[PDB]
Write a protein that binds this ligand. Structure first.
Ligand SMILES: Cc1cc2nc3c(=O)[nH]c(=O)nc-3n(C[C@H](O)[C@H](O)[C@H](O)COP(=O)(O)OP(=O)(O)OC[C@H]3O[C@@H](n4cnc5c(N)ncnc54)[C@H](O)[C@@H]3O)c2cc1C
Ligand SMILES: Cc1cc2nc3c(=O)[nH]c(=O)nc-3n(C[C@H](O)[C@H](O)[C@H](O)COP(=O)(O)OP(=O)(O)OC[C@H]3O[C@@H](n4cnc5c(N)ncnc54)[C@H](O)[C@@H]3O)c2cc1C
Ligand SMILES: Cc1cc2nc3c(=O)[nH]c(=O)nc-3n(C[C@H](O)[C@H](O)[C@H](O)COP(=O)(O)OP(=O)(O)OC[C@H]3O[C@@H](n4cnc5c(N)ncnc54)[C@H](O)[C@@H]3O)c2cc1C
Ligand SMILES: Cc1cc2nc3c(=O)[nH]c(=O)nc-3n(C[C@H](O)[C@H](O)[C@H](O)COP(=O)(O)OP(=O)(O)OC[C@H]3O[C@@H](n4cnc5c(N)ncnc54)[C@H](O)[C@@H]3O)c2cc1C
Lengths: 333, 341, 333, 341
């Protein structure tokens, strides 16, 4: 029976925890992973961030520099691990929160073995656990291998395969870049993908949304190398799957052994279905981070819908600070 | 490492289990509840079915008869309890399945303490755990009590309250009927609610969809409501089933209607229904934009080792009813035995 | 060679014309119809507005009252006719504007027989001429009659037919109500339709957006009568057409002789394609009424995207006044 | 009241007309231009094709040869003029078709002064009249000159200017090549542009899509750029084909790039291409959300008395080219003669 339950223990949770720990109110953080790390523990082997440590730091404690390379997955995990420990956050892991229940004057946060009664709940569960794969005509038929980027690890199993990498943006480009080295790939995208200039990192992502808060594909090394191997040519979605291929709009067929779906993610709010707050679009209605339908619930770190850049290391701090503030207001009054 | 994992242990799971247990293939059933009973364990005190035991029976073993008329919640729980035990289904409870993962040639069904590798997964998790409450302007402001029908228990806490019962169909009518006796209620509905004739039960629900399933099967063309259970009939006689149309917004302690007038509201009981409770399938990527899965019959198009059973009209006409879930449950079992053979 | 060309001569054009005519600057209005009236000239026979004349008036001159009935189509046409004449707007009709061309320091507004050089263009062409019919699998096959609400006139040709009325909101309900009297109808809608209370008119539409600017189906008589004949039951979209029917999700077939598509309209900006300003969504990017890409172009009266309630008689005046203001500013400076 | 109305009178219209004129059925061609020529009448002064006359010929009558290499705009206009006249196509010009209306058993094709009742409509209106300019933050502010390639004529007005040529592919490269000589240009492109080898013309465009049409026909599986025309080659030699990536926003007299640096820009030539010019089909309700029509081949699914020809890859591989439009034009004629028979 604590004041604030933070569901999830990734960078967003950590961020809001940084801003609450000095306050009066109790909190616990529940996270589904074995160790610290958030979704980063499930990045592919070669995954690196698209901006340096300085543009990939949570509030307070900057990510330690990395030597001549954008931060690696393990390095991000490390930093979250150390960050969590540095500020001595009380995180219970592994814990799967199945539901958040309105018991009247407390919310109940429920897992298999334990429940927590709370005055406030912050849902910071990210997106990784809710990957999106669009349904195409023929999916029933397609015998070949299918793997969402969430679960992409290494290009080895795709060695020699006819592979479709599906979905634009950074994951598709980074995965294509890697898998095109060992397999014959086609990048399928809904729109012609748009690249940043070679000399700017994903900082420009943060910065664009700082301009918008004052009111596109990063050319990371592998992706740059893939341009040089003439492998970033994208095409438009196919019309349907066949048993071992796809048919494109022009009526032609192609063989496909494997599709890597880099089609992104939805907010992983399963644990909020019990609250009735999940809107038709699979999100929650918010003002800022705050649930309109349930104002003791805050949602943090999910995407543009919870705050410009909130689903980034550098960016999640604005809305995390503001969430902490609004929550401290709520609980004072 | 079994052949079929049935996620959930409500009447739908039971139904498909009845049809697989005689086969060669292994299965286990995982269910979230403490005991047998499915969502029925969470019905309100006075909840009764809208059709007799004969029209509320799973395959094989009929529900034992009940007096005067209509089976009670406990009686339905009882029958599921006994049904499960009668056919000796191996159900692990309580188990919360958090995700279904594609490991290549097995699906992994995952809970906190245990995982199961399976050749086939049947998701029969119902809707109760995914109640729907529509957002209205002002929900942020509304200080008064809010309770979805999922959690409605008894009218006692609403004693004397100004209550909105929101949402038509059977739950709203049955809850209104009960809560109007002790509180001042307004039934708010998107459309004028439509009542069945007083002398027909929810059997007509089943029957309509049998006509429509005779139609789809045979190939013929066809075309295209509140049961008057006792309490609901009584509520008509107390002139209490007058419904009005949605308000425009909440205020801190009321709602403002379209005409601009305000009303005080202490409590809103949302009888606005439920979505399919497929949280455990988000990990599979199969959840479509409408929060469902794309199916042919019960079968997942995107993931054909996954079947979905018992959720609603979208998994089969009448599949989300005791009597009705058996068609699609038999056909799921058949299709699954085909797949594995 | 005038200062302002107003393309289109419906209520939106009229509205902005009311606000410019007292100013210094010249303007002409070009409209495609034979007579005054805008899209109203193409309403079905029984079409009436969903709110009284007082809640269906343009600026200045109120619509004359109507006796115990919401204003009729002819009455709206009449009022536009008289309104246009009352303020002596110079409207050239019939004139089809095919394109708006950037000639440097003038825009050129082009029709077959005439061109106009202008400092400013206001596009107030409404939506009627750009009806939307969604494509369903099987449309190629469907032999039966098809008619968008734009062209619906009377229920007589549907006499005895198996009819699908497709699309919710007011047109579907009003057309269903009428056609269900003489044909066997199914109302197909993407979502369960939501009715206003019986004693409130489409004024509540205006009012909702006045609340939002300070910051759903009207039960018109026929539609009320149709509820009483138990005919407003809606169902969800079918999955596909067959040659003489549709197949629903449950796999069942139904015979359909006729589909009336009440699936609405897009903005009728064909004449702006030449300007390059039509965004991917088939609209123009705006601040208020003003084209971002082409700031001598204003768009008025189209929908929520040009202004809350701007596509209504009562509502179009806010954004029409503001357009006139912004245009008078532009041309002074 | 004719059988077939062909809307538009460019090379696509001509092509399908070649294939219908020997048939029994009447047709008329309506075209918006003052003279024959299609969009070619609006090409820039120095515009030449990217492949020789032999690879730029419509069906039947080949384009007459040209010296040194590559047919000029006037030469293409000429050939369309003569082609139209040679086969005596009845083309009404200038006629702007504003809408195509379904009157039941005829389609009505409408212009200001005249209407035509038709059993079949072929929309062959190209893309030129629907140029695309993407919106960037700051477009409201940008005071400097803006000109889509559609209207580019000559580099003279850009003399000495700081110019952005926006958009890759052939137009941007050809316009840059010309304007870089007289102005200070930056080529802005979404991706690094890719050049064909110096010794191959836009024939390779046709040929790629013949391989792909041999593939679709025969049923085999297959898989899935700037021609180095003379001026463009010259521009490489002047080191002027260096492209950069889109800027982030316009300012009043410049752009700000991603790195945060600013540049002055007097003029932007948008070589960002074209959409299908189907305005006259909005009235039919057939325009899909992507601004196209749903087709099987050339044929409208929603309105099967409507065919669309010559627009791009979506109406047929290479159909928006002189050499390429003939496959789909023959097949359209065939399908239309079938329909009417
Ligand atoms: C492929 C990829 C590349 C990216 N690259 C970058 C980059 O270069 N720079 C950048 O700034 N951002 C990047 N991001 C974005 C973002 O920083 C990561 O997505 C990060 O995972 C977001 O952290 P989070 O805390 O919002 O979500 P997560 O890291 O997912 O944290 C949520 C935590 O909550 C847990 N959880 C979920 N549900 C429950 C439950 N019911 N009960 C208990 N725990 C639960 C999860 O297991 C997880 O441990 C990238 C994202 C992806 C997918
Ligand atoms: C108010 C109301 C009245 C109704 N009245 C009738 C009636 O009169 N007659 C009739 O025939 N039908 C009626 N129904 C419909 C239907 O019979 C019930 O909804 C019933 O619960 C459907 O059974 P099910 O097995 O499909 O779903 P459920 O009964 O919910 O069973 C699914 C089981 O799966 C479990 N589960 C969910 N998620 C997980 C997970 N991740 N891991 C493990 N287990 C999980 C649930 O806890 C539950 O135990 C009614 C429904 C409602 C809401
Ligand atoms: C079925 C229906 C019912 C409605 N009911 C109501 C109601 O009850 N109350 C209410 O307030 N609103 C109602 N509306 C909304 C709105 O008031 C009407 O749509 C009205 O038509 C909008 O007027 P407008 O001037 O924006 O558009 P329009 O009336 O279409 O005016 C545009 C004019 O521009 C012309 N035009 C188009 N393109 C060109 C071109 N290229 N060159 C020259 N001229 C051109 C058109 O022919 C037309 O004459 C309704 C709309 C519909 C469709
Ligand atoms: C810069 C550029 C370079 C190109 N170079 C080559 C090349 O080298 N080789 C090659 O093979 N192809 C080339 N193309 C492609 C193609 O040959 C041209 O686009 C050509 O115009 C396509 O012919 P069309 O008949 O399909 O379209 P169009 O030539 O535009 O003809 C359509 C006709 O219909 C008319 N029209 C439009 N709307 C209406 C209406 N509502 N009513 C009546 N008439 C209407 C138009 O005015 C036009 O006269 C090029 C295209 C561009 C833009």
């Amino acid at each position: 029976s604590t004041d604030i339950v933070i569901i999830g223990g990734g960078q967003a949770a950590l961020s809001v925890a940084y801003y609450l720990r000095r306050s009066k109110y109790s909190f616990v953080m529940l996270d589904a992973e074995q160790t610290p790390g958030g979704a980063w523990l499930h990045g592919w082997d070669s995954l690196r961030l698209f901006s340096p440590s300085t543009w990939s730091s949570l509030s307070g404690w900057q990510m330690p520099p990395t030597g001549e390379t954008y931060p690696s997955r393990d390095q991000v995990v490390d930093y979250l691990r150390h960050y969590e420990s540095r500020y001595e956050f009380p995180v219970q892991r592994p814990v799967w929160v199945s539901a958040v229940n309105n018991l009247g004057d407390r919310l109940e946060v429920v897992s298999e073995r334990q429940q927590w009664r709370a005055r406030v709940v912050i849902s910071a569960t990210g997106t990784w656990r809710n990957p999106f794969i669009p349904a195409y005509p023929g999916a029933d038929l397609f015998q070949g291998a299918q793997l969402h980027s969430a679960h992409y690890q290494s290009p080895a199993p795709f060695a020699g395969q006819k592979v479709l990498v599906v979905g634009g943006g950074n994951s598709g480009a980074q995965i294509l870049a890697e898998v095109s080295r060992v397999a014959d790939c086609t990048w399928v995208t809904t729109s012609e993908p748009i690249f940043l200039p070679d000399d700017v990192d994903g900082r420009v992502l943060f910065q664009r949304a700082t301009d918008r808060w004052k009111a596109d594909v990063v050319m990371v090394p592998p992706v740059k190398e893939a341009r040089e191997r003439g492998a970033l040519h994208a095409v438009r979605p196919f019309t349907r799957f066949t048993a071992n291929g796809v048919v494109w709009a022009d009526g032609t067929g192609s063989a496909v052994d494997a599709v890597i779906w880099c089609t992104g993610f939805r907010p992983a709010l399963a644990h909020l279905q019990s609250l009735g707050v999940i809107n038709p679009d699979g999100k929650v209605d918010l003002a800022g981070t705050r649930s309109l339908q349930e104002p003791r619930l805050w949602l943090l770190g999910y995407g543009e819908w919870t705050g410009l850049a909130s689903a980034t290391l550098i960016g999640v701090g604005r809305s995390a600070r503001a969430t902490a503030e609004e929550i401290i207001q709520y609980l004072d009054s």
